[PDB]
Amino acid sequence: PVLTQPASVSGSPGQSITISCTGSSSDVGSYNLVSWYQQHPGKAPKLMIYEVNKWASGVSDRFAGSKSGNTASLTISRLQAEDEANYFCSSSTNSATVIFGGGTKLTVLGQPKGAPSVTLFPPSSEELQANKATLVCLISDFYPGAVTVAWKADSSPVKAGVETTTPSKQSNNKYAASSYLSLTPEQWKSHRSYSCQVTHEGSTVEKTVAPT
Amino acid sequence: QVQLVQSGAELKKPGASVKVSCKASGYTLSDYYVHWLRQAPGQGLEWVAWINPTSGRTISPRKFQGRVTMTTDTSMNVAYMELRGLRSDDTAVYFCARGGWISLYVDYSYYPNFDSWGQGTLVSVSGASTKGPSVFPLAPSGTAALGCLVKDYFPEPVTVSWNSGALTSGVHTFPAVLQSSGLYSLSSVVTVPSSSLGTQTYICNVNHKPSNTKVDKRVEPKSC
């Protein structure tokens, strides 16, 4: 078998939200052994609820579990921006095994936009001594996770050897990205300045470096 | 505290076998069940097994029954998982997690109550050969940011620390970029007080386990 959850769920601060987990009678229906886990991007899951309605350590009353027939339910009240995470249901089976749900990506609304912090790094002397050059553009602390990057040699746009990561959620519910302009030492020195520009909803923030 | 520490990342070609160890501390392994699960990157959780360290008894879903071998070494407080017939579908992060209390009178084996997890072990299966990374210092630009550039490596992941774990505050390791060449590169910055430059020694400790590459890089201000 497999447990079934809503693939994604959107909520908004203050008001409640409810994730469902629909199983069979041979697992969710035959045991009071339903557990809910919360996962942030880079971390291992964290036990929220266990045995249908019991709280794990470090869990507020905001989280509450329940069961009706073959369907478990995870209710969250007084929503916060930190609750933005993936939620998994899980149950024991009659086969003495453990079954998991596909996971529910919860999205808390009303999050204030955040300006991208850009830090630009010129090629190190060492890397240049390895006969290659790489400009490193590091973007952080932005929201929503939609960003644009434009590289600039002197004053002409560059699209050759760019490679940009897709934005990924940090700990603080904000996003991070990076771009890597890869060029040759000769190209690095054949210009007076290079510039990494970042567009984040209308507004842009850019940094510059120069070989001298 | 109660802690589970798993073995380093691994790169395996299809058809081969992998063995992940999970090392317990802060409690006795044989007092609780050990569960093993995995998570294909960007996908969901998949429970693979439970084991009783005292009896040796194991259970796994039908999907893994022939391929998986769970064992323990209580003398070292270690749990082991061997996965065989490795396929591209098997590339995932593997977690061991501590289960319920092992009791003579009650059966907690299948209780899905994991109150302690291991950090995870990324095992990737592919025909591509491992590539160690090249590490370069990113010289410091009342605070400043200095960093480390980790370039051209395969597979994921690399682990970056600073001052051999002594520096923990202000560190930001960015997610790696997959270049068209099929390789990975990432960066890791520290934001330190500008005053501390020139007297405090900053070193990034980069480790790429699949290629067994351990590089310590002293990052120091530009030659000015």
Among candidates B117, B185, B187 on the partner chain, residue whose Cβ is nearest the Cβ of A138? B187
Indicate the burial class of B167 (C-beta count within 10 angstroms; 0-12, 13-18, 19 or more): middle
| Elucidation method | X-ray
CATH no. for A1-110: 2.60.40.10
**Considering only alpha carbons, which residue of chain A is nearest residue B111?**
A92
Give residues after which chain A gaps, C-N over 2.5 angstroms. Answer: none
Among candidates A47, A95, A99 on the partner chain, residue whose Cβ is nearest the Cβ of B115? A47
Same-domain status, B30 and B91: yes
What whole-number distance in Å separates Cα of residue B83 and Cα of residue A105?
Answer: 29
Same-domain status, B108 and B135: no
Q: Kindly state the tokens that stand for A141.
A: 């602390």
Among candidates B45, B46, B136 on the partner chain, residue whose Cβ is nearest the Cβ of A127? B136
Task: State the greatest distance between any 2 C-alpha atoms of chain B, in Å, as a whole number.
Answer: 72
> Which residues of A are less than 8 Å from B139 in CB distance?
124
User: Cβ distance B215 to B158 under 8 Å?
Assistant: no
Residue B47's nearest CA partner among B28, B68, B31 is B68
Same-domain status, B184 and B90: no
Phi-psi category of residue B152: left, alpha or beta, with phi > 0 → left and psi -120 to 50 → alpha? left
| Chain A: closest CA distance from residue B138 (Å) | 6
Domain boundaries, chain A: 1-110, 111-211
Same-domain status, B99 and B134: no
Residue in the block written with tokens 């045995």: A51
- Mutate: best of A21, A98, A120, partner B, most B CBs <10 A: A98
Domain boundary among B86, B102, B127: B127
Say yes or no for a CB contact (<8 Å) between A103 and B44.
yes
Give the other-Cβ count within 10 Å of B68's Cβ. Answer: 18
Per-residue HEC secondary structure of chain A comes to CCEECCCEEEECCCCCEEEEEECCCCCCCCCCCEEEEEECCCCCCEEEEECCCEECCCCCCCEEEEEECCEEEEEECCCCHHHCCEEEEEEECCCCCEEEECCEEEEECCCCCECCEEEEECCCHHHHHCCCEEEEEEEEEEECCCCEEEEEECCEEECCCCCECCCEECCCCCEEEEEEEEECHHHHHCCCCEEEEEEECCEEEEEEECCC
Q: Which residues contact A190 (CB under 8 A, 6 or more apart)?
A: none
What whole-number distance in Å separates Cα of residue B41 and Cα of residue B64?
Answer: 19
User: Cβ distance B99 to B49 under 8 Å?
Assistant: no
User: How many A/B residue pairs have CB atoms within 8 Å?
Assistant: 118
Let me know the angle formed at the C-alpha of B66 by B121 and B7, rounded to the nearest 5 degrees. Answer: 15
| Chain B: closest CA distance from residue A173 (Å) | 14
Q: Kindly state the tokens that stand for B87.
A: 């396929």
* B89 secondary structure, DSSP code: G
> Which residue type does B220 have?
E
Superfamily (CATH) of domain A111-211: Immunoglobulins (2.60.40.10)
Helix, strand or coil, per DSSP, at residue B156:
coil
Q: Do domains A1-110 and A111-211 have the same CATH topology?
A: yes
Pairing label, strands A8-11, A104-108: parallel
> Which residues of A are less than 8 Å from B186 in CB distance?
178
Q: Which domain holds residue B212?
A: 128-224
Domain boundary among B97, B127, B157: B127
What whole-number distance in Å separates Cα of residue A166 and Cα of residue A146?
Answer: 9
> Which residues of A are less than 8 Å from B112 in CB distance?
33-35, 50, 90-92, 98
User: Cβ distance A208 to A135 under 8 Å?
Assistant: no
> Which residue type does B195 have?
S
Say yes or no for a CB contact (<8 Å) between B45 and A121.
no
Let me know the angle formed at the C-alpha of B5 by B3 and B11, rounded to the nearest 5 degrees. Answer: 160
CATH code, domain carrying B209: 2.60.40.10
The dihedral sign for the CA sequence B51, B54, B55, B56: positive
Same-domain status, B108 and B184: no
Q: Kindly state the tokens that stand for B187.
A: 């960066």
How far CA A210 is from CA of A121, A126, A164, in Å, comes to 10, 17, 21
Q: Which residues pair with A4 in a beta bridge?
A: A22
Give the other-Cβ count within 10 Å of A37's Cβ. Answer: 26
Let me know the angle formed at the C-alpha of B143 by B142 and B148, rounded to the nearest 5 degrees. Answer: 160
The dihedral sign for the CA sequence B59, B65, B66, B72: negative
Say yes or no for a CB contact (<8 Å) between B59 and A96.
yes
Same-domain status, B141 and B121: no
Same-domain status, B111 and B134: no
Same-domain status, B55 and B102: yes
| Chain B: closest CA distance from residue A16 (Å) | 24
Same-domain status, B121 and B190: no
| B124-144 CB burial, b ≥16 within 10 A, e <16 | bbbeeebbbbbbbbbbbbeeb
Same-domain status, B30 and B107: yes
| Chain A: closest CA distance from residue B73 (Å) | 23
**Considering only alpha carbons, which residue of chain A is nearest residue B144?**
A119
Residue B58's nearest CA partner among B70, B76, B43, B46 is B70
Residue in the block written with tokens 């302690």: B116
Domain boundary among B127, B157, B173: B127
Q: Which residues contact A41 (CB under 8 A, 6 or more apart)?
A: A168, A169
What whole-number distance in Å separates Cα of residue A45 and Cα of residue B98?
Answer: 12
What whole-number distance in Å separates Cα of residue B188 and Cα of residue A167?
Answer: 16
| Chain A: closest CA distance from residue B59 (Å) | 7
Indicate the burial class of A30 (C-beta count within 10 angstroms; 0-12, 13-18, 19 or more): middle
* B75 secondary structure, DSSP code: T
Q: Which residues contact A144 (CB under 8 A, 6 or more apart)?
A: A111, A113, A175, A201
* B197 secondary structure, DSSP code: T
Residue A102's nearest CA partner among A83, A86, A113 is A86
Helix, strand or coil, per DSSP, at residue B211:
helix
Say yes or no for a CB contact (<8 Å) between B186 and A178.
yes
Say yes or no for a CB contact (<8 Å) between B120 and A44.
yes
Same-domain status, B149 and B85: no
User: Cβ distance B123 to B92 under 8 Å?
Assistant: yes
Q: Kindly state the tokens that stand for A98.
A: 């453990």
Q: Kindly state the tokens that stand for B79.
A: 């749990």
Among candidates B117, B147, B223 on the partner chain, residue whose Cβ is nearest the Cβ of A45? B117
Say yes or no for a CB contact (<8 Å) between B172 and A126.
no
> Which residues of B are less than 8 Å from A74 in CB distance?
none
**Number of domains chain B contains:** 2
| Chain A: closest CA distance from residue B149 (Å) | 8
Share of chain B residues as helix, strand and coil, in percent rounded to the nearest 5: 5, 50, 40
